[PDB]
Design an enzyme around this catalytic site. Sequence first.
Site, mmCIF file in Angstrom:
data_model
loop_
_atom_site.group_PDB
_atom_site.id
_atom_site.type_symbol
_atom_site.label_atom_id
_atom_site.label_comp_id
_atom_site.label_asym_id
_atom_site.label_seq_id
_atom_site.Cartn_x
_atom_site.Cartn_y
_atom_site.Cartn_z
ATOM 1 N N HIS A 144 -3.242 4.163 18.090
ATOM 2 C CA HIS A 144 -4.254 3.468 18.898
ATOM 3 C C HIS A 144 -3.859 2.069 19.319
ATOM 4 O O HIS A 144 -3.956 1.655 20.520
ATOM 5 C CB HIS A 144 -5.633 3.450 18.182
ATOM 6 C CG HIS A 144 -6.702 2.676 18.859
ATOM 7 N ND1 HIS A 144 -7.691 3.212 19.639
ATOM 8 C CD2 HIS A 144 -6.958 1.341 18.830
ATOM 9 C CE1 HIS A 144 -8.452 2.266 20.134
ATOM 10 N NE2 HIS A 144 -8.034 1.091 19.670
ATOM 11 N N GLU A 145 -3.342 1.263 18.407
ATOM 12 C CA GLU A 145 -2.887 -0.089 18.666
ATOM 13 C C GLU A 145 -1.765 -0.107 19.691
ATOM 14 O O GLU A 145 -1.822 -1.012 20.567
ATOM 15 C CB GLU A 145 -2.536 -0.880 17.402
ATOM 16 C CG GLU A 145 -3.736 -1.182 16.493
ATOM 17 C CD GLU A 145 -4.859 -1.920 17.160
ATOM 18 O OE1 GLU A 145 -4.746 -2.691 18.086
ATOM 19 O OE2 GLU A 145 -5.995 -1.711 16.682
ATOM 20 N N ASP A 197 -4.210 -5.471 9.398
ATOM 21 C CA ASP A 197 -4.958 -6.196 8.365
ATOM 22 C C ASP A 197 -4.530 -5.684 6.991
ATOM 23 O O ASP A 197 -5.018 -4.602 6.590
ATOM 24 C CB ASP A 197 -6.485 -6.137 8.609
ATOM 25 C CG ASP A 197 -7.269 -7.056 7.711
ATOM 26 O OD1 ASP A 197 -6.688 -7.739 6.841
ATOM 27 O OD2 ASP A 197 -8.504 -7.134 7.779
ATOM 28 N N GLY A 238 -12.500 -4.211 5.456
ATOM 29 C CA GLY A 238 -13.325 -3.570 6.468
ATOM 30 C C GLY A 238 -13.307 -4.297 7.784
ATOM 31 O O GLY A 238 -12.471 -5.197 8.041
ATOM 32 N N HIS A 269 -10.166 0.249 26.009
ATOM 33 C CA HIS A 269 -11.025 1.268 25.416
ATOM 34 C C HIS A 269 -11.628 2.217 26.450
ATOM 35 O O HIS A 269 -12.017 1.858 27.562
ATOM 36 C CB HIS A 269 -12.085 0.817 24.412
ATOM 37 C CG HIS A 269 -11.561 0.155 23.183
ATOM 38 N ND1 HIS A 269 -12.038 -1.056 22.670
ATOM 39 C CD2 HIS A 269 -10.574 0.532 22.328
ATOM 40 C CE1 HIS A 269 -11.417 -1.296 21.553
ATOM 41 N NE2 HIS A 269 -10.521 -0.393 21.312
ATOM 42 N N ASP A 317 0.726 -1.219 0.000
ATOM 43 C CA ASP A 317 0.000 0.000 0.000
ATOM 44 C C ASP A 317 0.783 1.314 0.000
ATOM 45 O O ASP A 317 0.234 2.345 -0.417
ATOM 46 C CB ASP A 317 -0.972 -0.026 1.199
ATOM 47 C CG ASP A 317 -2.004 -1.127 0.994
ATOM 48 O OD1 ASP A 317 -1.968 -1.819 -0.045
ATOM 49 O OD2 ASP A 317 -2.841 -1.234 1.910
#
EC number: 3.4.24.17
Length: 165
Positions: free
Chosen positions: A119-120, A99, A79, A129, A25
């Site tokens: 975030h990870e 992913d 997704g 969370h 990507d």
Amino acid sequence: FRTFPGIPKWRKTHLTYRIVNYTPDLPKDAVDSAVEKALKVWEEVTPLTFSRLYEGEADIMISFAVREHGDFYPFDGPGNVLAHAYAPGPGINGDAHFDDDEQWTKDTTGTNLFLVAAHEIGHSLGLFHSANTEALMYPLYHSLTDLTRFRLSQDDINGIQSLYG
Ligand SMILES: O=C(C[C@@H](NC(=O)OCc1ccccc1)c1ccccc1)Nc1nnc(S)s1
Ligand SMILES: [Ca+2]
Ligand SMILES: [Ca+2]
Ligand SMILES: [Ca+2]
Ligand SMILES: [Zn+2]
Ligand SMILES: [Zn+2]
Ligand SMILES: [Zn+2]
């Protein structure tokens, strides 16, 4: 904020990380900087320090995968689940999997690698969370977060400090 149960946390302040493989990507430079920017966010508000390894098992092993990848939690295609990370600990604990069926950009629009990584890594640090809607750790951070105005919320901060002083 919330932490994982039993409150797992790193028992040393100097941690290593290794980026295992790359996503088609983006250019490699772009992934290096997304990751590095993400660790630094966290490094600024904790007494921890991160150093990169190019071989060996690093504390925080970062890799890109699709569907089944060597743990009990298969990726799920385009997704839904974007990524997953483990609480602090040895072996697979602290590791972050992305992913690769997702389209990783450096954009404001799409699945942003810097933001997801940031975030990870909170999870790899021991945060779970948050209910605070402005938090990096709230579950919908990926959609509500305006990268131009990016900052750790006070919730984020109070949480990581309750673990690391
Ligand atoms: O919600 C977690 C937990 C993770 N499992 C984990 O850390 O088990 C070790 C552990 C458990 C309890 C106490 C101490 C350590 C996981 C990994 C894969 C699937 C489900 C859960 N990860 C997240 N990554 N991104 C998110 S968005 S959520
Ligand atoms: Ca690990
Ligand atoms: Ca997915
Ligand atoms: Ca991809
Ligand atoms: Zn030491
Ligand atoms: Zn995984
Ligand atoms: Zn999460």
